[PDB]
């Protein structure tokens, strides 16, 4: 049972909480697979080895259209290799925001697939615990292809050490300690909630606040977009989001619910908008943040940032790359108050996360992107800088930002061409065709 003789590694594919996904080619069978590489040094193993191996064997025995099929498992002296089938379609929410129309029917199909997979896995007595939209992938880029869930049953054995974006979906019983499979349902519920509103039912500025909200267990449907949503869906959400597990609806029961039953043979535009805002700011938001960072800093800020950036830009090309980011990281953090005693590997890892704040994805971090990093969001997106920015964008001072004004500030000046119209619409909540300060602020602060 050895990896190198069985599979061949090529290039990194995706980012996982427990380990990193890499595309691999097979020696003898000549097929492409996806391997999750988990580090014994980086992550802790909760259960003993034999238990993990047993669970993995059971997983290798299993098969369902809505779960990630697990082919092989390899244990290296240093690392763990978890081999399964490949996925090219990417995460679900991205595909959702890619499309123009999103109705309760689509969400019903999605949740049906999810709950089907969940029901199968529960039939074999397996619990995910950590269920997120990221764990929902599409096997192919083809439209209306079905969903496959990944990292099923791995959470029980591993606990990561890196942590905001799992608090939205975690179940109260999981937070309090011991739990059963129904926690997954709760998680699914949360997703469904988002799917219909584009906002988390339990929300907060940071992990602590979000966890406070979910632990309190209280939530509402007061948001305006819920007026566009049928009552049955809200009822199903209520049954899924009950604090006490025994009273909570099971996955199998939920699969036969009235909502999912009926809606599987209007458009929730504000919802999908809020999903786009939720997701990576694939919007006017990135351009606005970059503009604010590069052009709207005070003299002291510009001086300090330019100085530090010069110190980190070793070859002086005007870009920061992986190596320069690594060599300059500890000193940058030393500058930002917050790490002398930092292991080279976690330094490379955090440097990689910052490489995930590389908006244009050219592989380099510019000065503007760098300003987002060096300046905490509290300062860069203060009330003052936001107001000044909005005032700059709003030339005629009407109180709203027009498409033409956006085209004027940072524009090739194609007001038509559906460029600026599409870019505007992604932020235009009330559909007046303009951006008031509320929407600008919500855009840059991910607020609802």
């Amino acid at each position: 049972a050895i990896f190198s003789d069985r599979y061949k590694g090529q290039r990194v594919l995706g980012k996982g909480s427990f380990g990193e996904v890499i595309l691999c080619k097979d020696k003898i069978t000549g097929q492409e697979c996806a391997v999750k590489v988990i580090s014994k040094r980086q992550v802790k193993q909760k259960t003993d080895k034999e238990s993990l191996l047993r669970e993995v064997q059971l997983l290798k025995q299993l098969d369902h259209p809505n779960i990630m099929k697990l082919y092989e498992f390899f244990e290296d002296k240093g690392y763990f290799y978890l081999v399964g089938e490949v996925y090219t379609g990417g995460e679900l929410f991205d595909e959702i925001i890619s499309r123009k129309r999103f109705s309760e029917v689509d969400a019903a199909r999605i949740i049906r697939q999810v709950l089907s997979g969940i029901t199968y896995m529960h039939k074999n007595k397996i619990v995910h615990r950590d269920l997120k939209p990221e764990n929902l992938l599409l096997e192919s880029k083809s439209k209306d292809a079905n969903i496959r869930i990944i990292d099923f049953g791995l959470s029980t054995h591993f606990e990561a050490s890196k942590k905001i974006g799992t608090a939205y979906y975690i179940a109260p019983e999981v937070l309090h300690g011991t739990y059963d499979e129904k926690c997954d349902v709760w998680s699914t519920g949360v997703i469904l909630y988002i799917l219909l509103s584009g906002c988390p039912p339990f929300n907060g500025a940071n992990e602590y606040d979000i966890l406070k909200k979910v632990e309190k267990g209280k939530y509402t449907f007061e948001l305006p977009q819920w007026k566009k949503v049928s009552e049955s869906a809200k009822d199903l959400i209520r049954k899924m989001l009950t604090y006490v597990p025994s009273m909570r609806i099971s996955a199998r029961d939920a699969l036969d619910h009235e909502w999912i039953q009926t809606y599987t043979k209007p458009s929730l535009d504000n919802a999908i908008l809020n999903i786009r805002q939720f997701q990576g700011t694939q919007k006017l938001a990135q351009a606005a943040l970059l503009y604010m960072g590069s052009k709207l800093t005070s003299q002291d800020e510009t001086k300090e940032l330019t100085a530090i950036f010069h110190k980190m830009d070793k070859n002086g090309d005007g870009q920061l790359d992986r190596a320069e980011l690594i060599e300059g990281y500890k000193e940058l953090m030393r500058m930002k108050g917050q790490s002398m005693l930092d292991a080279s590997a976690v330094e490379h890892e955090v440097d990689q996360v910052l490489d995930a704040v590389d908006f244009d994805k050219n592989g380099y971090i510019e000065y503007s992107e760098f300003v987002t990093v060096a300046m905490d969001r509290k300062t860069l997106l203060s009330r003052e800088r936001l107001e000044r920015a909005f005032r700059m964008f709003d030339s005629d001072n009407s109180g709203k930002i027009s498409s033409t004004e956006l085209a004027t500030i940072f524009g090739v000046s194609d007001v038509d061409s559906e460029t600026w119209k599409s870019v505007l619409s992604e932020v235009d909540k009330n559909n007046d065709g303009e951006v008031d300060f509320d929407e600008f602020q919500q855009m840059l602060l991910k607020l609802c």
């Epitope: 590069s294 510009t302 830009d313 002086g316 090309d317 000065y367 940072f410």
Partner: nanobody, 124 residues
């Protein structure tokens, strides 16, 4: 005066020839400016070509112009140069230059003080 960049050196040339373009700053100095050259073909969005910081050079464009175009800098003469070699019928377009503070960006929209540019035409 007011603040703008002016381009010169635009003309008609045979394929495979060489041409030199100039960008002069009026109303401000290039001392703290990173200047980049961009080419726009009619009905197409502006394309990053090259950029020079206050000092160093970056090849922003796709590698189609790599090794053929050089960007130069003379602060005293307030001028940025673009040396174009081995011209192709692919290269004919409007060439203009823009400036951002200190460091060369790779987002077109962070640039300012755009110029009317110069017509560069390669024979067909």
């Amino acid at each position: 005066m007011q603040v703008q960049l002016v381009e010169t050196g635009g003309g008609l040339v045979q394929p495979g020839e060489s041409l030199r373009l100039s960008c002069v700053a009026s109303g401000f100095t290039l001392d703290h400016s990173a200047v980049g050259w961009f080419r726009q073909v009619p009905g197409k969005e502006r394309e990053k070509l090259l950029c020079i910081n206050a000092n160093g050079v970056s090849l922003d464009y796709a590698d189609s112009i790599k090794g053929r175009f050089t960007i130069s800098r003379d602060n005293a003469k307030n001028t940025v140069y673009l040396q174009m070699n081995d011209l192709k019928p692919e290269d004919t377009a409007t060439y203009s230059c823009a400036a951002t503070r200190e460091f060369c960006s790779a987002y077109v929209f962070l640039y300012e003080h755009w110029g009317q540019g110069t017509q560069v035409t390669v024979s067909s």
